[PDB]
Amino acid sequence: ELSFGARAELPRIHPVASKLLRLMQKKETNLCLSADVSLARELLQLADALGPSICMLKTHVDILNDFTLDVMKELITLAKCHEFLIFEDRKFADIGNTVKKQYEGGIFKIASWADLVNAHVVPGSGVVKGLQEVGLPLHRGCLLIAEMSSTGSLATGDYTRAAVRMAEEHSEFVVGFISGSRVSMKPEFLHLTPGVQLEAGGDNLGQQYNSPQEVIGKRGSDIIIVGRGIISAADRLEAAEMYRKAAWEAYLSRLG
C-alpha cells in the first residue's frame, strides 16, 4: 500500500485527487467535516476553526437558509487559507441533460465553488457524461456513490460493481467513491466513508454508524465523513481532533 503522499504522484492520478492527497499527508488528516448547518455564520466559523484539522469540508448548500454566492467566496478563502477541499454532496441523480444545468447554473452555481461533487450511478453513465461537460473545463472532480450508510440501501452487489466500472471508465473526471469500504483495487481512486461515529448506533431515520478504526483500518477506506459526531458536540474543535487522530492512526496502522 502506498502512502497518501505517494498516491498523490501516481501516473493516472487526477489533479484534484493529487491536491487532496498531498494536503492529507502534509496536515496528517483524513477527516472530512460534514458541515450540516443551516446558518452561513456557523458554517464559516466551523470552517475557520476546524480547517487545520480537516482535509475536506462537505456541504449541503440546499439546507443553508442564508445561502449567497458571497458565503461561498468566504468559504473558498478559508479553504485556501487552511488547505482543504470543498465537496458539495449534491448526489446528482438525473439524466445527463438535466444534471449539467443543475451543476453549472441556477442560484447555487455549484461548479463555480465546489472542488468535488458526487453522483448516484442508478441513472446510468449519462449522469457522469452530463456533469463532465461542465466539470472537465473547470478542472473539477466527481465521486460516485458505490455504497450507502443507510438501512435498506440497495447499493450492494452488482450495483456497487457497476459504480466501480463507471468510475474506472470515466477516470478523466471521476476521482473516487462514496462507499463503506475499499471498492476499487486501483490506488488512484479515493474512498470516502460517511456513517462514522466513535460510539455505536445510528439515528431514527436509517443512519447507521461505524467507527473510524473499522472503516479506515479494517474496511480499507481513505477518508471519514463526520457530521453530528462533531457538529452536535459542545467543543467541535476537540471533537474534530478526536476524529482526525482516530482516522489518521487507523490509516498509519494499515499502511504498516
Ligand X SMILES: O=c1cc(O)n([C@@H]2O[C@H](COP(=O)(O)O)[C@@H](O)[C@H]2O)c(=O)[nH]1
Please enumerate, by residue number, every residue annotated as part of a binding site: 34, 36, 58-60, 91, 94, 98, 149, 207-209, 227-228
Residue 94 is a catalytic residue: yes
Q: Which residues pair with 116 in a beta bridge?
A: 87, 141
- Count of CA atoms in the C-beta half-sphere (13 A) of 54: 32
| From candidates 23, 110, 178, 242, binder to ligand X by CB under 6 A | 178
Whether 62 is catalytic is no
In whole angstroms, give the CA distance from residue 14 to residue 237. 31
The single residue among 3, 18, 150, 171 that binds a second copy, judged by CB under 8 A, is: 150
Which of residues 11, 199, 201, 205 is near a second copy by CB under 8 A? 205
Contact 197, 24 (CB under 8 A): no
Ordered alpha helix ranges (H), the chain: 4-7, 15-27, 40-50, 69-82, 96-104, 110-113, 126-135, 158-169, 212, 228-231, 236-255
Choice from 94, 168, 214, 241 touching a second copy (CB under 8 A)? 94
The residue whose Cβ lies closest to ligand PRO is: 201
Q: Is the CB of 176 or the CB of 212 nearer to ligand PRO?
A: 212
Cell 449539467: give the residue: 100
- Which of 209, 152, 202, 143 has the alpha carbon at shortest distance from 180? 209
Of the residues 27, 89, 100, 115, only one is catalytic, namely 89
What SS3 class is residue 64?
coil
The span from the CA of 51 to the CA of 46, in Å, is 8
Binding-site size for a second copy (CB under 8 A) equals 49
Please say if 89 is a catalytic residue. Answer: yes
Site string for a second copy, 10-39 (x = CB under 8 A): --------------------------x-x-
Distance of alpha carbon 93 from alpha carbon 145, whole angstroms:
10
Q: Are 233 and 46 in contact (CB under 8 A)?
A: no
Select from 22-30, 120-128, 211-219, 242-250 the region that touches a second copy (CB under 8 A).
120-128
Q: Which residues are catalytic?
A: 89, 91, 94
Q: Where along the sequence are the contacts to a second copy (CB under 8 A)? A: 36, 38, 60-65, 67, 89, 91, 93-98, 100-102, 105-108, 120-127, 129-130, 133, 148-155, 159, 162, 203, 205-207
